[PDB]
Amino acid sequence: MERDGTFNLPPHIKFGVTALTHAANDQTIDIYIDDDPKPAATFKGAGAQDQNLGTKVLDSGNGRVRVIVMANGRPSRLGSRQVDIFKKSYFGIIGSEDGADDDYNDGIVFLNWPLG
Amino acid sequence: MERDGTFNLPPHIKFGVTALTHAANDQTIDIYIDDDPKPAATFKGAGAQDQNLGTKVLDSGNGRVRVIVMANGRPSRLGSRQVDIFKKSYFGIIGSEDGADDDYNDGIVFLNWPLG
């Protein structure tokens, strides 16, 4: 039931994407919407360990959202879950590992929807 | 399975707390460890500014962590969930709302542990 950072959101809504990086591996985090081959958003690499890289606000398009984490020119292995609070506040959580590392906490990406 | 912003973490570890706001009113988010009289961390957001208030690293103490959100002179309604990625990367999620009929997204707080 962990998936690979791919989510189905309600179509045509705003959502938030927040990245928190633990490992200082200068990761690139790309967010892709539907079948567009260019990322709708990209986080540049952390400049420090346990760094909050900020929040981006995006439109879900037709609803398909994929997060890809790259470190050292390879895709980091990912685990993702969805959860919601009272079927009102929805979350996607992605843990990534750049190693070696077996722990899925080198990088974290939080998705939240809807906004407001 | 929604609780009220209280969590049991592994005793004496570091963990992260990240806070986002999306509210009309100023909000104060307090994180309390065990029975400590003062908050271990406080995030304060400005009304009408949707803000990523950053990530703080805390010590879990004896393991009890409580999140309280105040807005408009009163405690917000809270819902919380826990989730993990491959039983390795752990998360606590809190959504808060001032208004009783809203979407538990005026305040969002994420807890993550362990670090590395």
Numbering used by the authors:
A (entry chain A), B (entry chain B): 0 to 115
Sentences from the paper on this structure:
BC2L-C has an N-terminal region of 155 amino acids (the TNF-α-like lectin), a 28-aa linker region, and a 115-aa C-terminal region. Since the isolated BC2L-C-nt domain binds strongly to fucose but not to mannose and galactose, BC2L-C is therefore a novel type of lectin consisting of independent fucose and mannose-binding domains.
The C-terminal domain has sequence similarity with two-calcium bacterial lectins such as LecB/PA-IIL from P. aeruginosa (43% identity) and related ones. BC2L-C-ct bound to Man and α-methyl-mannoside (αMeMan) with a strong affinity in the micromolar range but with a stoichiometry close to 0.5, indicating that only one binding site per dimer is accessible. The dimeric association displays close similarity to the lectin BC2L-A, described previously. In contrast to other crystal structures in this family, no electron density for calcium ions and monosaccharide (d-mannose) was found in the final model, presumably due to the presence of citric acid in the crystallization buffer. Without the stabilizing effect of the two calcium ions in the binding site, the acidic amino acids that mediate their binding appear to point in all directions. A sulphate ion was observed close to one of the two binding sites, establishing hydrogen bonds with Gln241, His177 and two bridging water molecules. The main difference with the mannose-binding site of RS-IIL is the presence of His177 (Asn in all other lectins). In the absence of calcium, this histidine interacts with one sulphate ion but also modifies the conformation of the C-terminus of the other chain. Since the C-terminal carboxyl group has an essential role in binding mannose and calcium in all the other similar lectins, the putative destabilizing role of His177 could account for the observed non-even stoichiometry of the dimer.
